[PDB]
Structure formats: C-alpha cells, structure tokens
Design a protein around this nucleic acid. Sequence first.
RNA 1: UGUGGAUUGUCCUUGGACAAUGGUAGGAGAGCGUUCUAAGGGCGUUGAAGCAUGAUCGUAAGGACAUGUGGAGCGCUUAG
RNA 2: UGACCGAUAGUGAACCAGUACCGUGAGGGAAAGGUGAAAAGCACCCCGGAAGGGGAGUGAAAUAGAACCUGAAACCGUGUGCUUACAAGUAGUCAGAGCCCGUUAAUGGGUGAUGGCGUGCCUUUUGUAGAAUGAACCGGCGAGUUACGAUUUGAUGCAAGGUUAAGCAGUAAAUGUGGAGCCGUAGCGAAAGCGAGUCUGAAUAGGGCGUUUAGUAUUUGGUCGUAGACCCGAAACCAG
RNA 3: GGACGACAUUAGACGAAUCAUCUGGAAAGAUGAAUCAAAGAAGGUAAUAAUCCUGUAGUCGAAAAUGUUGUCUCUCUUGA
Lengths: 145, 205, 116, 60
Amino acid sequence: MKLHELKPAEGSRKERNRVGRGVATGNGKTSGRGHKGQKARSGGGVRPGFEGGQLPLFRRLPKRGFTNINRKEYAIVNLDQLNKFEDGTEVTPALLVESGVVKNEKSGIKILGNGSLDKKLTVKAHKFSASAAEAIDAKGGAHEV
Amino acid sequence: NYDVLKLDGTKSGSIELSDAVFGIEPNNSVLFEAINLQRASLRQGTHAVKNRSAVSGGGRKPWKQKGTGRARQGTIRAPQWRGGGIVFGPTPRSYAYKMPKKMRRLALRSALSFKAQENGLTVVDAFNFEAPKTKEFKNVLSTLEQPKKVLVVTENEDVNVELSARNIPGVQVTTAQGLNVLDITNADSLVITEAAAKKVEEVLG
Amino acid sequence: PRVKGGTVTRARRKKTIKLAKGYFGSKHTLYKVAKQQVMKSGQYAFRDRRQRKRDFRKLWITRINAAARQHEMSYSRLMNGLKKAGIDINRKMLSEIAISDEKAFAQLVTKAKDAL
Amino acid sequence: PKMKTHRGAAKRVKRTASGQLKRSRAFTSHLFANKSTKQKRQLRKARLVSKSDMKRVKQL
RNA sequence: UGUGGAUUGUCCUUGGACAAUGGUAGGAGAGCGUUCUAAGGGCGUUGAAGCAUGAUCGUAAGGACAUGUGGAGCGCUUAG
RNA sequence: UGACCGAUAGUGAACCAGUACCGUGAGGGAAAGGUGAAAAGCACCCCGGAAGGGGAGUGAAAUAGAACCUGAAACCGUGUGCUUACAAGUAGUCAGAGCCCGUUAAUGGGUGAUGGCGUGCCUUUUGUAGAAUGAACCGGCGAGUUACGAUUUGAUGCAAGGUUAAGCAGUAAAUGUGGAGCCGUAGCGAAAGCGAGUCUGAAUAGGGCGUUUAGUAUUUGGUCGUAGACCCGAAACCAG
RNA sequence: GGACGACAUUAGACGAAUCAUCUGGAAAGAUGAAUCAAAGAAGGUAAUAAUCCUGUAGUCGAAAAUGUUGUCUCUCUUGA
C-alpha cells in the first residue's frame, strides 16, 4: 500500500517480555527466579545431565556395536515415482537425477516395490528387490544391472 | 490490460503487454516483509562503548575489605561508579537477512499491479537527449501531467537520462534490473520506456 | 541510541507532592515521606467509606429511642409494633419526622400502640 | 558456535521419534537362575528424556 | 436483599441475560509513556522546547487548554 | 559515511592533562565549556576610606553587568488571610460549626472549635509496631544483553518436494546469477545385509520398532548450550 | 639496471541567477512574481537561504609523484 499507512499481518509480530521493570508487570524484583538457591545466582545452574551426585543415566548402561565406516547407501526409489512419464523407456540414473524424482545419488539406485507400476516401460537401474524385478518383468522391461 | 504508448501527447503504437504482471491481486503480507528487509540492509552498525575491562586504570582495591565503616568496593571503574564502565551497551553488527526467491518476485509483481490499478502507470516511447538538460526534462514532465513524486525507468545505462533530472525534489531514476520495492512504493506515478516495458515482463514472467 | 531520562521523573514526582497539600512538618515537602502518607490516605478513605453507613445508622436509632420514651414506650417495642401494623419506613425518615412535625410522630406511636 | 554432542552416548539408537537403550546388568555377573539371564530384550528411554534430549540432538 | 454502573467468560446467536471477579512464589493476555529513523500532513519572533501555577479530561500507567517566565525549535497519524 | 555520544556522556584529557595533588621508589591520577548581533564592558551626579549600592546612559532585553543563556528541588528569609498557652499526639482519614474567599462553574476553594476509627516503609522469615537489617535530605547516574547453534509456537510462500553457501558484475545498493551441499520422500539390525517389512534365531509361529506418510525456507515469541552471560563483594594463587 | 610515453589517482581553476512588500533591534520567515539545475550534501551570515558568503556537480589536472604499468629496446639464448 502507501509508505504512510502500511500495516503488518495480524498476529505476526509481538512485543518482547522485559523482566525486572516494576511490580505491576508481575516479573520484577525476583524476575521469576524464586528466592535463594544455586539456580538464582548470576550464570548459575548445573550441567545439562547432572543428577546431583547420583550416577548419570549414560554411565550405568553398557555400550555395544562398532561403526563400519565403509558403508554403501543407495537412493531408495518407489514404484509410484516411475509413473510420471507414460510409455517410458531406459530409466537410467542420469535420466532420473535430471528428472527431479531423485537427487545426489549416494552410491547407486535401489528400487523397492511399494505401489503398482501401472505401465509396461523398460527399467534399467543398479539393483532392485525380489518384488521390483517381478513387477518390471510383468511390464516388459529388460531390467539390466 | 490495453495500455496506450505516448510521446509529448502524441499517441504511438498502443501496446497491450499486461497479463499476470499488471492487473493481478497484490499481497499485503509479502509486500510488508519486502519493505522491512529493504531498509534493514541499508543500516551501518557503527556503534560501540567501553565495558568494565576497557576503561583506563582501576586495578588497585580502593580501601580495606572491612574495618573502615564504608561499603565494600573492588575497583574504581565499576558500573555503579561515576568513572565509567557500561554493562550491556551497543556493539558493531549487521541487520541484513535473506528471503525465498519466490517471495522476492511475488512482492515485486504485487507492487507494479497496485500502481496499474491506481491509474499511476505511463508507458512512454524511447527518449534520449544530446546532453543532460535539466530544463528540457522540466518541460517534459510539465506536458505529461503527473504527481510531484515520479520514478523514470532506464533500459541499459542512459548517461544523459541519469546525469539530467537527478537534482529535482521528488524524482528518482533506475534500470529494469535495478527495480526495488521501496522506490516503486515511494513514487506516485511510473514512466517506463516501451523497449524497457517488455524486458521486465520476461524477467518477472 | 542512548535515551537519557529527564522531564518525566520530576513530572510524576510533582503530582504526588501536590496530593499531600496541608500536611504538618516535612510531609508536604519531601517526596519520600509524601508518597508513604498518600499511600496510607487511600487505604484509610476506603476503610472508612463503609464505616460511614454504620455511624449514621446508629445515630438515628439513638434519636428515635429518645423520642419514644416521652410516650412511655421503648425502641424495641415501638419497632416490633410498627412492623406488625405493616408499615415500611426508614430509620433516617422516622428520626427526621420526630425532629420536625412532632404531631405526625405522636399519631404514628398510637398506630403502633393498638397494633400490639 | 555449533553445539557439541555427548560422545559417550554410544549407547543409544534413534528410532523414528524416540531413543532405544541397552540393558544394565548385562555382564560379568552370572550366578543367576535362567529365567533371569534370558530377558535381554530392548527397552527405550523413559520420560526422563526431558532431562537429556538436548545432548543427543544430532544423533538423528 | 434492594438500586445504578465496570469488566470478563458464556450464551443469544445486541442488549436482556446466565453464572463468575481475596491473593504470595509462579503461568497467560491487553495497554501507557521515553530517545532515534521512514513516509504523509502540520505549528513557530503575531513567540518553540523547558520551568511555575490552576477548582479540567480518561477504568490505571497518563492527556489536553488557558496564564506568567523563556528566546529557537518542536508536535500529530501509521509502522520500525 | 553513521535509526553513534552531546560536557556525571564521548578518550584519563572539548578548558591550565598525564597537569593540581599523593608516594623514598615502581606507580596512582582529578575538578573545570556557554554575556551580546557588535565591548557599544555602566561617561557623568549622590552616600562610603574602599568594597558595593541609588539615579542616569549603551542595548531588542541590565531580575543579559564577567557569582554573566535557561535557573528545578533540598535549604534560608520578609510580609500577610484563618488558627493556637487544661493538653497524652505513626500526625492521617470520615463527619462537622464559625470566619474569610471567588474557578477550567461545580451538589466550588482556604482555614479547622469538637467527635468516631487508626502501632511508618524495604528486606528476611513458622511469625516483625518490633528492642532483627537498610536509608540524614534533595538532584543526576546505576542490573536478563549480543553473536553463533538446538528445540517448540504464531505468520506467510510453495508443496512430495523445499531451499541455498562461498563467490561474481552493482547506489558499502543485498536483486540478478551461482546446484559443492542440507532437510524430507522407508525403515529394521552390532554388522554383512534384506527391504513395506526387518531383526529375533532351531523357529514365517508369539512378540520389538516400523507401514496408513506432510514437509520445508525465512522471520516473531518462550526456554536452553558455548562465551564474564542479571549486577556489585572476598581471605588467597602465580608471573615480572 | 634505466632510457620511452599515455593514462586512473594526490594541491591549487573557473565555479549557474532574486527582487518587492509585511512584522522586527535585524529577516533567510509570511506573501507575490520570477528566473540556472552533470551542482535541492553541508556550515556561516543580527531568525528557518538551491540564487549574500564557504563550498558542492563538473571543468584545468599538478612546476610532479608513483599507482594499473598499456608499451620499444637492453643484457636476457642455444636446444632438439
């Protein structure tokens, strides 16, 4: 609108709450911090996890399992993300990354049958499951690894 | 949608170049954030004060801890002392942020449409002066009856249109690529060139 | 921007010193003592704003009890017989009539005397 | 700066929403009856997760 | 209890209601004023800001208007 | 150049500043801006030894005369309306004669012979009129802030998608361009692994966590993490 | 290791054109009519000045200086 009558969205901006500025505000003097103790001291308080002396929760439970850095992650793709183009052919990773249905291929492309293909297009990815191939076989595509 | 090209009264090839850029519904929530962020990056954080560990001196205890009958002090540059020592004062920082590209375009198209639905748009024909003549631009604006505040639009780098009509109270010059949401919301009328009238219809279309 | 205080702390301190006008000593000069005296005045006025409806009520009773013993009668008895004859009159009005037209009051006593 | 994780919570795996933990008493103590040793099932963390859910916050 | 008024939450779906309204540590909601910026429109040697006095106005923080002193700047509306 | 300060602020220092002053020495370290447009800075007369006054004169102004723009409180005085020497008092407040007034004009204002009721304020406490703590009075200054992260709520844009970083050509324009990356769309298991299911293990059986999918980018509020982290205050430790 | 210039930058250059009334101790104010503008940033002038000073936009740059060094030679050579 004008620069001398502009108004913001309703309930979009609010005023900040200032503590210690009177007794009518209801947050003065003590400023909602109690009376005494170690939680009312400037910059006081225990570490996030301290039990006050009792053994911490993450100290009684034992650890187990390694990490195995060398891990192969495959971009999971459903069967409902392949029915975007009718009468498709040769759905390679290069045509899938530029399709917008998949991006940043971690290390290959695995297909998982979650829905119905509802088409007879030729598939061609890295590897599939024991159902994906079956669905592709029913369609008529030459799924090659 | 049917605008009429003009040139000192004379009407030229009427151009109906106006679809989703002009005559659309403007947003009153995406136009407020576009103006609040426009003047937010036009601020310079050049303000600072000295704290308790910045004032000169104040390293020796004033008197004894107890046995004098006075308040227990620690330094001569404390915050409650007249010497100095601010607590939480201002500090050098920036006030500029960012917003989604989609919103940036919406707000830009939400301002031009408002100027087209308020009879404040005027698509004139290509114009060029041999030398920056402020008097020549004075009579030029006198013919095209408009408001005090205006905002001429340039196509590329009109040096004769930039140097001239720049020292006028209530007049601003800019290019199609340099179209903001503050200068367009500060003016009352718009004067874009026919050639630069379709250039903004493609970049914002 | 530094916002230094001024012309706002003395404008509110000059409004509490004007309310304490007529006090004895330094209770109308200093503001530290004026605020305390003005803070108690409001607590007193509100407390005696309900005690003013008890003093006047007791006053009328005393006046009606003295103007009822002249006709060999008692306030308790007079009132008892005045309510048995179905009469709705305030204690402030009864006393107002006794101080004025005595004849009227005299007749009223007889009406509440044969109603017993 | 960035916030740091508790590196000694190598004892919790993030489920979809919540966290799964390991069973204490799990070793070097086996003079036990056999109905007892056998229950080495998986339990999740309790609603003490309001004391320590900010410390494992990028385990995700 | 009688008579007039204030706020709520309800209710009915425009004012009669229905109920309700002690309060510390605390939680939630709606406001007043101070300094600076932007836009629009204003006031001022025919006397601005400040200061002094007054029997005035708003449910509170507060806001106007005359009069004296003073001799150059300062309000108002919307937002930050 | 500035949504930086404007003389207790900003440099310790706008002026006589590292100067008065303080210590054997290393060293510590203040207070203090403003007549007027132009000195035209009171010629002359009167009182006084002088200081300073009262006239006069200069000026728009002399209650602008170097204690020199404006001049607020505490504090100190002079005149004047009503009241006070038989009285027991957190000094007020409610009712109320008499004697004087006359406004922002309203069931107005000042003073107070008598009557009823009434043990200041802050902090800390099971509890304070307390003989528990703090303040002689007045004015000025003096305490939840910012940067980067995490989580939740409101608002808006797009939606199975959402969005950019450092950069580069620009009013130090913060709008274009920039697809390394980040979150989500699929989980389960110590892993290899399999996958709408998976691990369990002798068991597809019974169970555990999943499946019926709405998220994401920026901003607003609440709280938290790393920094001194709401403000002031120690005995003491180490280096030169 | 230095002759060779041209140019981006650091003093100084010239630097557009206002009168009249009113109130005033004095107007830049009000009011009325004008006129420059690659200069309507800012300060002074007996009050608030784009046209009374100081400048500013921009023009010579500058008796130079190097900074981008754009450029000829000069000793820089023998390698396959």
